[PDB]
Amino acid sequence: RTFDLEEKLHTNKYNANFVTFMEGKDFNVEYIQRGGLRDPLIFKNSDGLGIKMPDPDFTVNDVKMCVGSRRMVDVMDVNTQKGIEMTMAQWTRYYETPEEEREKLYNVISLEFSHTRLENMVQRPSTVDFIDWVDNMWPRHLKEMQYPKVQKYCLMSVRGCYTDFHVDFGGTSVWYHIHQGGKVFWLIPPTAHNLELYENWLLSGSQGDIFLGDRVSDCQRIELKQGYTFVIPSGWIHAVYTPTDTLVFGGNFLHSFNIPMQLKIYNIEDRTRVPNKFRYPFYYEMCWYVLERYVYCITNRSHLTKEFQKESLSMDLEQVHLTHFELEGLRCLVDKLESLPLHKKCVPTGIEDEDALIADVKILLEELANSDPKLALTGVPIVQWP
């Protein structure tokens, strides 16, 4: 902590214009097919989004219950890092310690609660339910851990905590709803140039002597108030600061319209030697399912084992025009997966022949090469009914 955060919080120089303000109603799948979720969005009203949030007088304490006290939570010491020593019990008591009495500066930005009752209490925007790689790609009988359980998040921050510049794991995109309080964001776009600066910055030790926002040409500091829903696209480098005690509900997802950046970031994580602890769980296994789903949804030719096919069929019994976004995306998924050394192709377990799959994708990618953008804008993803 060499640079003055206060300065970075009050100078009016991060005036870039990256964020697009819109109405939740306008946020549908045709929008994603049209823009490819390349812009960070802010919805002042939750109207049209299809989200559901607890009675707003909900408090951290109300959270220490639903999840479960004595339920170890990863808590970071915004003055250095880690200290996940505590559970909700110790934490809740910390949240309510008047600022001055407050000894440490703690932040909880990892509580993933889909396990707890809190789940059916919180609901993400329906558009995100349409493109989420998990709900839509991973075999459903495996989520009814052997499935990426990194979907719903509950961040709880105190006045003063600051999360330094980073790009969310796996190049995931993220949605946040400020339930109580507010947050200040510094946004930097995944410009090839910026993404280089950022990687070199993580190698030099992410010094903390340099404010990354000052290293780039254009940065936008945004302010999220109570009630806003925030969407950050895959790849963006951002830093966050909690001006006051805030409670946020959100999540990190993967979709099929910005696959190249998603892989772009995984490879940064690979070169930056990020510990396998903080890696998106089952990244490549997921990728294999994405392809198998595409081939099956477009071609009706399944590539899962008979067993898996049976479950998918049981559960149920209870041409096509792609955007360039997906065509270029599938291309990367194919090339990426092929450049993986044999022992580490992480072929999921529900897949018969990966080669037959890969062969079928390459053929699929050439037959569909000429897709009409207009005709592609179907308003609904081709991969549906997980």
Ligand X SMILES: O=C(O)CCC(=O)C(=O)O
Farthest-apart Cα atoms in the chain, separation:
66
Q: Which residue in the set 156, 178, 240, 322 belongs to the binding site for ligand X (CB under 6 A)?
A: 240
> Using CB distances below 5 to 8 A depending on partner kind, what does residue 263 bind out of Fe ion, ligand X, none?
none
Breaks (C-N over 2.5 A) in the chain follow: 144, 318
Q: Which residue has the tokens 């192709």?
A: 345
Radius of gyration of the CA atoms of the chain, in A: 21
Q: How far is the CB of 42 from ligand X (least distance, A)?
A: 15
Beta strands 41-43 and 20-21: pairing type?
parallel
Q: Which residue in the set 157, 172, 194, 323 belongs to the binding site for ligand X (CB under 6 A)?
A: 157
Q: How far is the CB of 63 from ligand X (least distance, A)?
A: 15
Q: Which residue in the set 75, 109, 128, 351 belongs to the binding site for ligand X (CB under 6 A)?
A: 109
Q: Are the C-beta atoms of 333 and 291 separated by less than 8 Å?
A: yes
Q: How far is the CB of 181 from ligand X (least distance, A)?
A: 11
Residues 119-158: x where in contact with Fe ion by CB under 5 A, - otherwise, as a string: ----------------------------------------
Amino acid symbol at 37: L
Output the six-digit token pair for 336. Answer: 């990426």
Stretches 166-174, 213-221, 342-350, 375-383: which one binds Fe ion (CB under 5 A)?
166-174
Q: How far is the CB of 107 from ligand X (least distance, A)?
A: 6
Q: Are the C-beta atoms of 262 and 236 separated by less than 8 Å?
A: no
Q: Is 172 in the site for ligand X (CB under 6 A)?
A: no
Output the six-digit token pair for 355. Answer: 């080669």
Q: Which residue in the set 30, 112, 119, 168 belongs to the binding site for Fe ion (CB under 5 A)?
A: 168
Site for Fe ion in 276-335 (CB under 5 A): none
Q: Which residue in the set 36, 37, 63, 107 belongs to the binding site for ligand X (CB under 6 A)?
A: 107
Element (H, E) at 289: helix 283-299
Output the six-digit token pair for 277. Answer: 């602890």
Amino acid symbol at 299: T
Output the six-digit token pair for 157. Answer: 């921050």
**Chain residue at closest Cβ approach to ligand X:** 163
Q: Are the C-beta atoms of 237 and 166 separated by less than 8 Å?
A: yes
Annotated binding-site positions: 163, 166, 168, 183, 238
- Binding residues (CB under 6 A) for ligand X: these are 107, 109, 155, 157, 163, 168, 183, 238, 240
The site for Fe ion (CB under 5 A) is made up of: 168
